[PDB]
UniProtKB/Swiss-Prot annotation, chain A:
Keywords: Acetylation, DNA-directed RNA polymerase, Nucleus, Phosphoprotein, Transcription. One of its GO terms (molecular function) is DNA-directed RNA polymerase activity. Transmembrane segments: none annotated. One of its GO terms (cellular component) is RNA polymerase III complex. It comes from Bos taurus. Component of the RNA polymerase I (Pol I), RNA polymerase II (Pol II) and RNA polymerase III (Pol III) complexes consisting of at least 13, 12 and 17 subunits, respectively. Pol I complex consists of a ten-subunit catalytic core composed of POLR1A/RPA1, POLR1B/RPA2, POLR1C/RPAC1, POLR1D/RPAC2, POLR1H/RPA12, POLR2E/RPABC1, POLR2F/RPABC2, POLR2H/RPABC3, POLR2K/RPABC4 and POLR2L/RPABC5; a mobile stalk subunit POLR1F/RPA43 protruding from the core and additional subunits homologous to general transcription factors POLR1E/RPA49 and POLR1G/RPA34. Its main location: nucleus. This is DNA-directed RNA polymerases I, II, and III subunit RPABC2. It is found in: Nucleus; Nucleus, Nucleolus. The chain holds residues 50 to 127 of 127 of the full protein. It comes from the Eukaryota. Belongs to the archaeal Rpo6/eukaryotic RPB6 RNA polymerase subunit family. One of its GO terms (biological process) is transcription by RNA polymerase I.
From Swiss-Prot, chain B:
Belongs to the RNA polymerase beta chain family. This is DNA-directed RNA polymerase II subunit RPB2. The gene is POLR2B. Catalytic core component of RNA polymerase II (Pol II), a DNA-dependent RNA polymerase which synthesizes mRNA precursors and many functional non-coding RNAs using the four ribonucleoside triphosphates as substrates. Pol II-mediated transcription cycle proceeds through transcription initiation, transcription elongation and transcription termination stages. RNA-dependent RNA polymerase that catalyzes the extension of a non-coding RNA (ncRNA) at the 3'-end using the four ribonucleoside triphosphates as substrates. An internal ncRNA sequence near the 3'-end serves as a template in a single-round Pol II-mediated RNA polymerization reaction. May decrease the stability of ncRNAs that repress Pol II-mediated gene transcription. It comes from Bos taurus.
UniProtKB/Swiss-Prot annotation, chain D:
Changing residue 44 to A: Impairs protein folding and abolishes interaction with POLR2A. This is ATP-dependent DNA helicase Q5. It comes from Homo sapiens (Human). Belongs to the helicase family. RecQ subfamily. DNA helicase that plays an important role in DNA replication, transcription and repair. Probably unwinds DNA in a 3'-5' direction. Binds to the RNA polymerase II subunit POLR2A during transcription elongation and suppresses transcription-associated genomic instability. Also associates with POLR1A and enforces the stability of ribosomal DNA arrays. Plays an important role in mitotic chromosome separation after cross-over events and cell cycle progress. Ubiquitous. It comes from the Eukaryota. The alpha-helix immediately C-terminal to the Zn(2+)-binding site (residues 438-453, characterized in C-terminally truncated contructs) is required for helicase activity, is positively charged, and may play a role in DNA-binding and choice of substrates. The chain holds residues 501 to 617 of 991 of the full protein. Residues 1-101 are annotated as: Interaction with POLR2A.
Curated annotation (Swiss-Prot), chain E:
The tandem heptapeptide repeats in the C-terminal domain (CTD) can be highly phosphorylated. The phosphorylation activates Pol II. Phosphorylation occurs mainly at residues 'Ser-2' and 'Ser-5' of the heptapeptide repeat and is mediated, at least, by CDK7 and CDK9. POLR2A associated with DNA is specifically phosphorylated at 'Ser-5' of the CTD by CDK7, promoting transcription initiation by triggering dissociation from DNA. Phosphorylated at 'Ser-2', Ser-5' and 'Ser-7' of the CTD by CDK9 (P-TEFb complex), promoting transcription elongation. Among tandem heptapeptide repeats of the C-terminal domain (CTD) some do not match the Y-S-P-T-S-P-S consensus, the seventh serine residue 'Ser-7' being replaced by a lysine. 'Lys-7' in these non-consensus heptapeptide repeats can be alternatively acetylated, methylated and dimethylated. EP300 is one of the enzyme able to acetylate 'Lys-7'. Acetylation at 'Lys-7' of non-consensus heptapeptide repeats is associated with 'Ser-2' phosphorylation and active transcription. Regulates initiation or early elongation steps of transcription specially for inducible genes. It is found in: Nucleus; Cytoplasm; Chromosome. The chain holds residues 818 to 1442 of 1970 of the full protein. DNA template strand binds at residue 566. Residues 15-56 are annotated as: Bridging helix. This is DNA-directed RNA polymerase II subunit RPB1. It comes from the Eukaryota. DNA nontemplate strand binds at residue 571. Residues 266-294 are annotated as: Trigger loop.
Length: 78, 147, 209, 101, 592
DNA sequence: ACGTCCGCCCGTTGTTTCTGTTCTT
DNA sequence: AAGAACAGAAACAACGGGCGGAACTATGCCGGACGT
RNA sequence: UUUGGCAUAGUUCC
């Protein structure tokens, strides 16, 4: 039973993109076939569009509990 | 309270180098004038002004006690920068203050009382005129009042 | 004047009737709605040297959930209510087996009397209301949104639903005018229902503490 | 300040002899009643005679007693009741000057 | 010309006196520019410190750093500020007959049916009965929503701010699907009703299924659902918009998408947003308005610079000027000095031979029918002021008797004579000094009429739609009425409310502490919001209501007024490190 | 050639004052 | 019918902290006397 | 390839 919103907020999107770009720039495997791209931010955005970013977001409720949402499961608004 | 409500307004003077305020009749007596007629000659120039006379009456009602130059000087000097342990030194300090630090521009010689009394009376008279609404209060921003 | 005194007594009585109706006690429609002439006829149109003498106007009424739980509305005849007057009222309550009572004061109560009212709180509950505070009903003012006192079953359900500890709710002082109007102790939770400009309605909650 | 009321009542205690008692009678209504503050039979008969003179000058003793008893019932103390009877005598005097019955 | 009216234009030039006067005029503008800046910056800093840690949690509630609830839904509806638009409700203002004609969907005339709806649909509408029952139930729901709207919005204001622009969405649908408005459509009004009902279920602000959660969601989306039903009414769809099946489906999809996009994202710093949004207008900002008023409202003082108390009258006093002036007299303080003409203290021991020849007859009449002191206190009352307030010498005498008891004597003339005379005699402790204290007290402490601390009371007809009484006629319209409203100086709210012939509902002041101590905390919140709205909107500017609501809730969250100062900031049970950075560092750290 | 002595606002806390209670005579 | 000790609440006076944001030049000054 | 500070005055921009 998960009650938090099913959309990915702007802050979650920004942090996911930054962390994934850093991970790629630190010489890590990608989950998409780059068609000529070289910028880690561009590759991270491509992965987010493809729903292949391997991150699970841990959302802390104010009462101490938490919920784990994968990037695949969250509707990507922007 | 009842006595303050009946008195209304009183006129006091803040002499320099003195601990707190002094009623004006005390200072006038300390200058050497005893009679209310003479003090009112120094203050109210035209005696056909009953409103001015009534305005100055509560100030004279503080003269019910003090009646002499020696005791007036004692009362003035009681509140010096360093209050004395004796009385002659306090009275000498009071005379020194009234001769040296009160209105230096009028004079500092020994016989300056006859003119210091007139100028202090003029200050009180102008205060009465201001209180009666007969002259406009000054403004500090007027450039004739600057140097 | 006699007319003004009758008017003040009538207004105080009407406000107390409204207060009892809000507190859940059983006050009938005719008692709630009395015209000035009806009150004049029923209990004297002449106060000074007349039938209404700030006595016989005391109200005894039973709560809608328990006829055994009843409340008094006493009218002291003294501008400054005293320790002996409070003792007399507590004696009357003890003999009639009544737990709660209201006391409308002409001008005020001495601090000794107020402390002697506070002391017997578990034994008896008595509240002081000034004569000026009841000429109007503060609840009817348009600035005051509707207040509802919540039962301890609903408080528990609310806390469980939002997963809140009672420290985490907004607060309302026990000396608040509306809190005194509703007679609320510390630890009870009131519900505020008010219209909204951006939603159309908004329900808040306040903890009396 | 509230100190005024203490000063004032002190000065009025210092303004003692005992207050004079009421004595019963008289043509006036309820004239044996001591209930009107500072009232006496002589003050009531003086007010009734004033009302009778005004009504007779405008023109009967029943109307004079009715005006006195109404005014003694409505006024706070007998000293104000007498002043209000003299006020009603002055109003009857304006009616007679206007020629009104 | 003497007092500085420049007759010339800048092209013609200014004569020397006008030049100097113009320089004097421009100096004030330069001074105000150089002065307002620091105060505006300080106000903004205080607001930011007050609301720096208020956030939107994943619970959707609004809580501060100590997880104390400020709002159960942000902005009381749960939406984000930058996604909402101005819209009109279009079912609040119309009268009963116009409302029924515009929203009823007459299915009986059948010629309008043949003209607007298609032939295969008109037969269905005229044959079915379940369709007709649903269409009547829709209008019933709309009428109930109309009554709810009229309760929420008195004074008849249609303009409102809501997230989805339904009319522009309908226009876009018409242009996208090439709808021709001159032809009958293929949209079934039952399909319209069912589509709206199903759509309203997908617009969820409060998630849950308990009665509490369902009530919360209904309250959170009431206004928008009312607007949605009013716009997508079946008769309006059939007459005005003339949509189609696919067009209606696309419209519903777009409404869902836009509503879901216009929801506040958890993690927003709404407290800092509100601080900036309310403090940035301050740099561009007979009562006080603007920066001083904002300073007073933020740091509440018990002595406002210009306290006021607007008073509304109940009945015929509101219309007729007679009782209006009567209430004006009742509500204005007046001692004996306001009406006295002159006074004097005499020495007259003889009751008969009186020094003053005027009182002779009536003083003799008083004394002829009966110790005392020989001194006198003779006062003279000004006729103009005596007759202006509708006062009476008997009233003055009885007030004196109440104030002093029977230890005084009082004899008074009447208005018949040109000279109105009052004579007072007493029935250490010497007489002259006692009589001067009696006169002084009796002239500055008498309180003949009025309410204490109420200095001056005005009386003028309103000229604004918020200070006027607006009712609903029997035909359902809004009609504006002009009734006399008072505006006093100095505040004493409880007595004015308790006064006879004074409206106890609409009477209000502008002293926040008074509103608190008289009416509670919720009333103080509402009044504080109204005062902030007035000061902000005096300049014609607009600030979103969410920020106002957030500031007011932050100030009045803990049950007592919390001024935004060091006192209020440190009154919070927060960590010492948040307080140390604000107006007290060493003291707070050492105390902790 | 170094080393010794000499201009405005308003929240706290104090001081002082003014009534109420209870016991005793 | 009177008197005293104690205690709760309040009016006035004195005290202390608080008062915009950035940025760029320049100029004066950082203790004094002494002789064994 | 290494780092003085305190005060006062003037000026720029809202």
């Amino acid at each position: 039973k998960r009650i938090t919103t099913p959309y990915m907020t702007k802050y979650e999107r920004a942090r996911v993109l930054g962390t994934r770009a850093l991970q790629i720039a630190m010489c890590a495997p990608v989950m998409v076939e780059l068609e000529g791209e070289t910028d880690p931010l561009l590759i991270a955005m491509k992965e987010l569009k493809a729903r292949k970013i391997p991150i699970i977001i841990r959302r802390y409720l104010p009462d101490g509990s938490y919920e784990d949402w994968g990037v695949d499961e969250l509707i990507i608004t922007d | 309270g009842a006595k303050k409500s009946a008195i209304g307004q009183r006129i006091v003077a803040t002499l320099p180098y003195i601990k707190q305020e002094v009623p004006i009749i005390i200072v006038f007596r300390a200058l050497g004038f005893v009679s209310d007629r003479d003090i009112l000659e120094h203050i109210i120039y035209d005696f056909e002004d009953p409103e001015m006379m009534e305005m100055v009456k509560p100030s004279l009602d503080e003269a019910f006690v003090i009646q002499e130059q020696n005791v007036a000087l004692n009362f003035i000097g009681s509140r010096g920068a360093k209050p004395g342990v004796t009385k002659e030194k306090r009275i000498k300090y009071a005379k020194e203050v009234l001769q040296k630090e009160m209105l230096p521009h009028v004079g500092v010689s020994d016989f300056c009382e006859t003119k210091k009394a007139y100028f202090l009376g003029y200050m009180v008279h102008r205060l009465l005129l201001a209180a009666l609404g007969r002259r406009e209060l000054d403004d500090r921003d007027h450039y004739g009042n600057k140097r | 004047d006699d007319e003004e005194e009758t008017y003040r007594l009538w207004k105080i009585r009407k406000t107390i009737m409204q207060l009892c109706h809000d507190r859940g006690y059983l006050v009938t429609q005719d008692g709630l709605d009395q015209t000035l002439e009806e009150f004049k006829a029923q209990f004297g149109g002449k106060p000074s040297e007349g039938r209404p003498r700030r006595t016989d106007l005391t109200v005894l009424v039973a709560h809608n959930d328990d006829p055994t739980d009843q409340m008094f509305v006493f009218f002291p005849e003294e501008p400054k209510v005293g320790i002996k007057t409070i003792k007399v009222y507590c004696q009357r309550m003890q003999e009639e087996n009544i737990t709660r009572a209201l006391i409308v004061v002409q001008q005020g109560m001495t601090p000794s009397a107020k402390q002697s009212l506070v002391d017997m709180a578990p034994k008896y509950i008595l509240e002081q209301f000034l004569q000026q505070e009841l000429l109007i009903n503060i609840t009817e003012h348009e600035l005051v949104p509707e207040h509802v006192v919540m039962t301890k079953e609903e408080v528990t359900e609310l806390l469980a639903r939002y997963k809140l500890r009672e420290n985490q709710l907004p607060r309302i002082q026990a000396g608040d005018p509306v809190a005194r109007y509703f007679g609320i102790k510390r630890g009870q939770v009131v519900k505020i229902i008010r219209p909204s400009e951006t939603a159309g309605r908004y329900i808040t909650y306040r903890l009396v503490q | 300040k509230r100190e005024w009321n203490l000063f004032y009542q002190k000065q009025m205690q210092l303004r003692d002899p005992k207050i004079e008692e009421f004595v019963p009678p008289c043509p006036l209504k309820e004239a044996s009643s001591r209930r009107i503050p500072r009232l006496t039979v002589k003050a009531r008969e003086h007010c009734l005679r004033l009302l009778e003179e005004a009504l007779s000058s405008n023109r009967l003793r029943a109307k004079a007693v009715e005006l006195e008893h109404e005014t003694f019932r409505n006024a706070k103390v007998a000293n104000l009741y007498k002043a209000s009877v003299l006020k009603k005598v002055a109003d009857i005097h304006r009616a007679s000057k206007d020629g009104q019955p | 010309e003497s007092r500085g009216f420049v007759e010339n234009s800048y092209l013609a030039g200014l004569t020397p006196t006008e030049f100097f006067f113009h320089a004097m005029g421009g100096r004030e503008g330069l001074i105000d520019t150089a002065v307002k800046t620091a105060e505006t910056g300080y106000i903004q800093r205080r607001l930011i410190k007050s609301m720096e840690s208020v956030m939107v949690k994943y619970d959707a509630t609004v809580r501060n750093s100590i997880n104390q609830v400020v709002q159960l839904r942000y902005g009381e509806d749960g939406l984000a500020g930058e996604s909402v638009e101005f819209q009109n409700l279009a079912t609040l203002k119309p009268s009963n007959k116009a409302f029924e004609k515009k929203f009823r969907f007459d299915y009986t005339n059948e010629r309008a049916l043949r003209r607007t709806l298609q032939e295969d649909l008109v037969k269905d509408v005229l044959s079915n009965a379940h369709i007709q029952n649903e269409l009547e139930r829709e209008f019933e729901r709309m009428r109930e929503d109309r009554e709810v709207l009229r309760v929420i919005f008195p004074t008849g204001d249609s303009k409102v701010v809501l997230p989805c622009n339904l009319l522009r969405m309908i226009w876009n649908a018409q242009k996208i699907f090439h709808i021709n408005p001159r032809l009958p459509s293929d949209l079934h009004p039952i399909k319209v009703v069912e589509g709206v009902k199903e759509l309203s279920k997908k617009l969820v602000i409060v998630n849950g299924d308990d009665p509490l959660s369902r009530q919360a969601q209904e309250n959170a989306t009431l206004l928008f659902n009312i607007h949605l039903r009013s716009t997508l009414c079946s008769r309006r769809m059939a007459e005005e918009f003339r949509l189609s099946g696919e067009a209606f489906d696309w419209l519903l999809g777009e409404i869902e998408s836009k509503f879901n996009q216009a929801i506040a994202h958890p993690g927003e710093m709404v407290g800092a947003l509100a601080a900036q949004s309310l403090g940035e207008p301050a740099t561009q900002m007979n009562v006080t308005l603007g920066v001083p008023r904002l300073k007073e409202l933020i740091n509440i003082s018990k002595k406002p610079k210009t306290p006021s108390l607007t008073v509304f009258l109940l009945g015929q006093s509101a219309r007729d000027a007679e009782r209006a002036k009567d209430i004006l007299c009742r509500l204005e303080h007046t001692t004996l000095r306001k009406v006295t003409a002159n006074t004097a203290i005499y020495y007259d021991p003889n009751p008969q031979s009186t020094v003053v020849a005027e009182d002779q007859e009536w003083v003799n009449v008083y004394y002829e029918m009966p110790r005392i002191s020989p001194w006198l206190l003779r006062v003279e009352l000004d006729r103009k002021h005596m007759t202006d307030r509708k006062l009476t010498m008997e009233q003055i005498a009885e007030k004196i008797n109440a104030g002093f008891g029977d230890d005084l004597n009082c004899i008074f003339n009447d208005d018949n004579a040109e000279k109105l005379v009052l004579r007072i005699r007493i029935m250490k402790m010497d007489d002259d000094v006692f009589l001067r204290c009696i006169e002084s007290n009796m002239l500055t402490d008498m309180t003949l009429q009025g309410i204490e601390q109420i200095s001056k009371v005005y009386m003028h007809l309103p000229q604004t739609d918020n200070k006027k009484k607006i009712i609903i006629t029997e035909d359902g319209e809004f009609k504006a009425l002009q009734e006399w409203i008072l505006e006093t100086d100095g505040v004493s709210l409880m007595r004015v409310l308790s006064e006879k012939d004074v409206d106890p509902v609409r009477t209000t002041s502008n002293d926040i502490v008074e509103i608190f101590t008289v009416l509670g905390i919720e009333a103080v919140r509402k009044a504080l919001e109204r005062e902030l709205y007035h000061v902000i909107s005096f300049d014609g500017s607009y600030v979103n209501y969410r920020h106002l609501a957030l500031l007011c809730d932050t100030m009045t969250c803990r049950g007592h007024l919390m001024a935004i100062t060091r006192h209020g900031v440190n009154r919070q049970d927060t960590g010492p490190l948040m307080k140390c950075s604000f107006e007290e560092t060493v003291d707070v750290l050492m105390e902790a």
